[PDB]
Design a protein around this ligand. Structure first.
Ligand SMILES: CCCCCCCCCCCC(=O)OC[C@H](COP(=O)(O)OCC[N+](C)(C)C)OC(=O)CCCCCCCCCCC
Ligand SMILES: CCCCCCCCCCCC(=O)OC[C@H](COP(=O)(O)OCC[N+](C)(C)C)OC(=O)CCCCCCCCCCC
Ligand code: SF4
Ligand code: SF4
Ligand code: SF4
Ligand SMILES: [K+]
Ligand SMILES: [Zn+2]
Lengths: 124, 70, 88, 175, 556, 115
């Protein structure tokens, strides 16, 4: 509605639609970066006059497929090891210190972790 | 040729002995997003891909604002 | 130094007059590069955001060895220039 | 004067055949385009490493001749011009002379990176950055060099365009 | 040989628990761990602020993030220098994070304009955008330190920018060409027909000296003399006066502070007025026998002072008691007057009181030392005084001028701008000074221009261009000559060299780049004969760029 | 090996006077082929026009002083003669050679963008 489409936000107040061709992505309306040019603005160009908007490339936004994934938990330890969760075809191994009391994402995958005790506190 | 689905497209090229419908689940691709119907190359039609710049202009102009003499 | 070598280098007329070359020192050697254009040095392409340019000397840097060697070159080509003395 | 132009009459590429003439001049267009679709005679304008692939299409593995493709050296006898390889500045005036001598109809295929937009030598003092600055292009084949199948795919797509020609119906309906 | 194992030993030890964060490191391309684990090593094998993206996971320790804090800086105006000191990416800058890579950035050597020090800095740009500013070494002025204000106001040039001419039609500016803008000024100029004192010109803190000189010629050919900066000097002529150089310059310069004994703070907050020099005093104050006395509004400092009080009458008993006796005893005494003096009501009392103590002794002024100095805070005041761009009559400052032409001027709230006057603002931002305007002419950011600036020590430092001005903006002075043809007051200057040619007639020091022309001991004493509350509210709202900077919005 | 038509050995001339006579003959050689350059390249300008442009070319740079730089200017001008007479440059380059080409006040340059 000419307000969120051209503004960057953490989430979307409205429920997105897969069939709206003015959204930034099928699964998200507002862009996920301050410098990212809104899709509604870009499609208002000379070269989209006769080109069909339906067939244009609209990959699903990354910043949503991660937040659907439930947060991983660690039991009786304060170091989280993540190396892509795929074997030797992943990101370099990183160790995540769990001293802080919230969900700390991985360096590359974006996966979030926790401890055994703070499982009830972080989920709040 | 672009109508050939990418999974089979590697099989038709003699790069694999395992057809894409015979893959073991430990090897397949598992995606969190829907996998709709295959779409070929869309040249010479109005559905052709159009490039555009994904970045906002680096300079932001000033909004006109006036406050009168006290 | 007295030689009008610009008639044999084939460089365009604009290098002799409308361009300024800086002789600086980044830590043991000296370099020469041309100062940027007033306008048209870098404009954002309206298609894909490419950093367009009309200055053809933007990518050129000459690695010298000694200061007087660089000054000899600039006078030889008939180049306008100025020298930036590094801070001690 | 008296004038009344409708508004819902569609464009030529979308206009369906209505009367019997619209089927007659579609027959002439298909018959004439089928002749040009099959007798696809490019010109051997190999310039650089892209030219090796253009030879391998004629090789027994792919055999361009099976599709009715017979390279003709002279521009007069060639209705296509596959610009393969780097187009240097020293060549660009010569390329225009070769292109302008092709009798109509004429098509140009740009194969490889150098012919498309400059390629590896895009920042060279003596390389035309894309042959599209000199001759109009109808299809671009990407590669370095494009595989012998990629050129065939590029040929096929241009063939699919030629079979879409509607010249003799255009006279009846758009002229 | 045997020695090489030492490099292969320390290198191996450091890379033991180190994270494999090189692709995701903010400064992964220039850390002195990689470049020193290659040449010498083997081959096989909480948060502290909205400014420093701390990650101690990447530390190698050495406590250089600790040793510096308790030595130089000591809620710290200089804590951002820790970013440039830690070699590894343990402490990286937050505003710049994840935006650029060192192998791509283009570097230019230029100067700061936020304060009157004009410290040498290095700017790392990317096309038509400035990414980060880093300090470049200069022992004469700064020596590797720049305050958080300078290096975190970079993004202030990416918003609020004036990119087009603007014209007022009602109460809202509109987008209008340069042809109409240069005519709407001249069209309305003769609608009101200003008289000799009905034309006013105010020069801002960030206005360069080329515009300052070139504006006078345009002003003079239209017959006006109501020209000065956007200060609040109660005395209409400057109390020090633009007559002699020594009246308003750091005759000692910065390189003559570490060899001082007694320092007097004449109503100033050096922590908030010059952060680079504030630590310089703190560095001396640690090992030396330095004695500094506070005379002015009370404040909080990294170091204690020989504090006296808060009033002017505190200084009355200073130069005659033991407070001033040590000034006589000092072989190299220091007197510093901040930019907050001329603003005060008793500014005239300041110079007569002190210069009487500088005309009395002889050890204060030696063939190698000058005990009296000024500490201004703007980068255009000294340039104004060295060119005589100031009025010399209270009557002229009282005129209800019909045509006020602003040139970078913002602090003009206490300036009585008549409501009916014709106000034209030329600048490079939309801020307080912009609202008052009628026809706006976009200028240039200091990085986008070759502008010759003069610091508070009298040193003439220019700038080398980094980027083109945004939009269709032009150079600062080029508008004035362009505006000259539209008023019949055309100036004979047609290129930037001629603007420097005009500076030759102004003074000989203006054409000496990075060269300071002092005041001779045989004349500076004659300039002494002429004489016979902290000025800053918000540290992060001082100049135009800071106010419009999104980063400083995290400093409040 | 047999050198091509209108070739000369590259020689470092060590006389001021000899270079003067070499140039004078060269200028006549261009004028002798004035008719050919029109017919060879199909130029739109008549024979007198080419001589006028050739004269504008020769008049332009007659005041050079350095003998070491005299030979270089005579060497390359020989190549220009050899390239043109042998009909080596394409038609377009000669047409554009003669088709190349007062300034404006500061207000005019300030408004549009100058340089
Ligand atoms: C001896 C001549 C024999 C001609 C053989 C070529 C056939 C041809 O040219 O056929 C191609 C053309 C046109 O294509 P279409 O498929 O009919 O287009 C119509 C598509 N509808 C029907 C789906 C809308 O057909 C004709 O006009 C048929 C009549 C001519 C026989
Ligand atoms: C006397 C003169 C010399 C001989 C003339 C014949 C030369 C060869 C003609 C080539 C024809 C051609 O090319 O037809 C083939 C092309 C190729 O299909 P497409 O282009 O993709 O469109 C077709 C698909 N649509 C329309 C949906 C987009 O069309 C056709 O399928 C035409 C329809 C088939 C016609 C069959 C019925 C008519 C039979 C007539 C023969 C008894
Ligand atoms: S695109 Fe590649 S293969 Fe083709 S000519 Fe250029 S360099 Fe050679
Ligand atoms: S500081 Fe250097 S070695 Fe350590 S993770 Fe960053 S780039 Fe790699
Ligand atoms: S300065 Fe850097 S390397 Fe040294 S102790 Fe601090 S974080 Fe570690
Ligand atoms: K660092
Ligand atoms: Zn991970």
């Amino acid at each position: 509605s000419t307000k969120e489409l051209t503004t960057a936000r953490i989430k979307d107040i409205s429920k997105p639609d897969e069939n709206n061709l003015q959204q930034q992505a099928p699964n998200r309306i507002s862009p996920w970066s301050k410098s990212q040019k809104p899709r509604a603005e870009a499609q208002d160009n000379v070269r989209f006059a006769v080109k069909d908007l339906a067939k244009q490339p609209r990959p699903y936004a990354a910043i949503d497929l991660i937040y659907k994934q439930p947060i991983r938990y660690i039991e009786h330890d304060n170091v989280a090891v993540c190396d892509g969760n795929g074997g030797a075809q992943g990101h370099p191994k990183v160790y995540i210190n769990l001293d802080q009391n919230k969900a700390i994402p991985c360096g590359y995958c974006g996966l979030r972790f926790a401890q055994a005790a703070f499982k009830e506190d972080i989920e709040s | 040729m672009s109508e050939v689905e990418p999974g089979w497209h590697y099989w038709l090229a003699y790069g694999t002995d395992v057809p894409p419908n015979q893959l073991k689940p430990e090897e397949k691709s598992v995606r969190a997003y829907p996998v709709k119907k295959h779409v070929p190359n869309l040249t010479y039609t109005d559905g052709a891909y159009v490039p555009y710049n994904t970045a906002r202009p680096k300079c932001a102009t000033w909004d006109p604002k006036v406050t009168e003499r006290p | 130094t007295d030689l009008a070598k610009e008639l044999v280098s084939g460089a365009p007329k604009e290098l002799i007059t409308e361009r300024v070359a800086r002789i600086y020192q980044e830590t043991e050697t000296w370099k020469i590069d041309w100062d940027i254009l007033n306008k048209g040095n870098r404009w954002e392409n309206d298609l894909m955001g490419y950093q367009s340019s009309s200055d053809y000397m933007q990518g050129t840097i000459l690695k010298f060895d000694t200061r007087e060697g660089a000054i000899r070159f600039a006078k030889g080509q008939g180049w306008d220039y100025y020298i930036q003395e590094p801070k001690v | 004067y008296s004038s009344d132009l409708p508004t819902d009459i569609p464009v030529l590429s979308k206009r369906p055949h209505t009367n019997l003439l619209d089927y007659t001049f579609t027959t002439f267009d298909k018959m004439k385009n089928w002749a040009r679709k099959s007798s696809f005679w490019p010109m051997t304008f190999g310039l650089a490493c892209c030219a090796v692939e253009m030879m391998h299409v004629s090789a027994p593995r792919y055999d361009q001749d099976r599709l009715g493709i017979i390279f003709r050296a002279s521009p007069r006898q060639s209705d296509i011009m596959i610009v393969a390889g780097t187009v240097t500045n020293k060549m660009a005036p010569a390329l225009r002379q070769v292109y302008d001598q092709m009798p109509y109809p004429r098509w140009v295929i740009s194969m490889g990176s150098c012919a498309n937009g400059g390629g590896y030598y895009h920042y060279s003092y003596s390389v035309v950055r894309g042959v599209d600055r000199i001759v109009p292009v109808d299809i671009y084949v990407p590669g370095c060099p494009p595989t012998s199948e990629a050129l065939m795919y590029g040929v096929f797509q241009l063939q699919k365009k030629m079979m879409d020609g509607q010249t003799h119906r255009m006279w009846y309906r758009s002229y | 040989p045997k020695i090489k194992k030492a490099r292969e030993g320390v290198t191996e030890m450091l890379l033991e628990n180190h994270p494999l964060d090189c692709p995701v490191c903010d400064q992964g391309g220039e850390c002195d761990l990689q470049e020193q684990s290659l040449r010498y090593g083997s081959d096989r094998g909480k948060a502290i602020g909205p400014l420093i993206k701390t990650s101690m996971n990447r530390c190698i320790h050495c406590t250089r993030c600790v040793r510096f804090l308790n030595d130089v800086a000591g809620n710290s105006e200089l804590s951002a220098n820790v970013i440039d000191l830690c070699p590894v990416g343990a402490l990286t800058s937050k505003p710049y994070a994840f935006r650029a890579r060192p192998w791509e950035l283009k570097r230019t050597e230029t100067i700061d304009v936020h304060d009157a020090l004009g410290s040498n800095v290095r700017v790392d740009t990317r096309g038509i955008e400035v990414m980060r500013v880093l300090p470049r070494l200069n022992d004469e002025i700064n020596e590797e330190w720049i305050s958080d204000k300078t290096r975190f106001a970079c993004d202030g040039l990416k918003t609020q920018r004036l990119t087009k001419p603007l014209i007022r039609q009602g109460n809202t500016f509109v987008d209008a060409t340069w042809e109409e803008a240069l005519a709407t000024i001249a069209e309305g100029f003769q609608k009101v027909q200003p008289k000799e004192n009905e034309i006013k010109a105010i020069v801002g803190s960030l206005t360069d000296l080329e515009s300052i000189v070139a504006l006078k010629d345009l002003v003079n050919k239209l017959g006006s003399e109501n020209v000065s900066t956007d200060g609040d000097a109660t005395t209409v002529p400057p109390a020090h006066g633009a007559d002699f150089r020594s009246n308003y310059i750091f005759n000692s310069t910065i390189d003559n502070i570490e060899e001082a004994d007694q320092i007097l703070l004449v109503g100033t907050n050096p922590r908030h007025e010059a952060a680079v020099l504030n630590a310089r005093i703190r560095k001396v104050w640690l090992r030396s026998d330095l004695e500094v006395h506070h005379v002015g509004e009370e404040f909080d400092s990294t170091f204690e002072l020989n504090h006296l009080g808060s009033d002017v009458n505190a200084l009355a008993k200073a130069l005659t008691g033991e407070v001033g006796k040590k000034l006589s005893e000092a072989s190299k005494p220091l007197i510093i007057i901040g930019s907050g003096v001329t603003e005060t009501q008793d500014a005239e009392a300041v110079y007569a009181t002190v210069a009487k103590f500088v005309t009395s002794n002889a050890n204060i002024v030696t063939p190698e030392w000058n005990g009296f100095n000024l500490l201004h805070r703007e980068a255009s005041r000294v340039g104004a005084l060295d060119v005589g761009f100031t009025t010399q009559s209270p009557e002229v400052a009282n005129t209800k001028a019909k045509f006020i032409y602003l040139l970078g001027a913002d602090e003009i709230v206490n300036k009585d701008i008549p409501k009916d006057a014709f106000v034209v603002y030329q600048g490079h931002h939309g801020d307080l000074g912009a609202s008052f305007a009628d026809v706006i002419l976009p200028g240039s950011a200091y990085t986008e221009k070759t502008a010759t600036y003069v610091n508070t020590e009298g040193r003439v430092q220019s700038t080398r261009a980094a980027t083109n001005p945004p939009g269709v903006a032009r150079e600062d002075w080029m508008i004035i000559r362009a505006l000259s043809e539209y008023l019949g007051a055309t100036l004979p200057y047609d290129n930037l060299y001629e603007m420097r040619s005009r500076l030759a007639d102004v003074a000989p020091h203006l054409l000496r780049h990075e060269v300071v022309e002092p005041v001779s001991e045989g004349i500076a004493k004659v300039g002494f004969q002429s004489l016979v509350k902290n000025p800053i509210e918000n540290f992060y709202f001082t100049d135009v760029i800071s106010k419009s900077s999104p980063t400083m919005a995290k400093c409040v | 090996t047999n050198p091509t038509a209108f070739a000369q050995t590259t020689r470092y001339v060590k006389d001021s006077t000899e270079m003067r006579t070499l140039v004078l003959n060269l200028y006549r050689r261009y004028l002798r082929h004035s008719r050919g350059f029109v017919n060879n390249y199909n130029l739109d300008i008549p024979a007198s026009q080419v001589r006028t442009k050739i004269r504008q070319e020769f008049e332009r740079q007659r005041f050079v002083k350095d003998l070491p730089l005299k030979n270089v200017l005579y060497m390359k001008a020989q190549m220009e003669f050899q390239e043109l007479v042998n009909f080596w440059k394409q038609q377009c380059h000669v047409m554009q050679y003669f088709e190349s080409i007062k300034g404006d006040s500061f207000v005019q340059k300030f408004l549009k963008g100058a340089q």
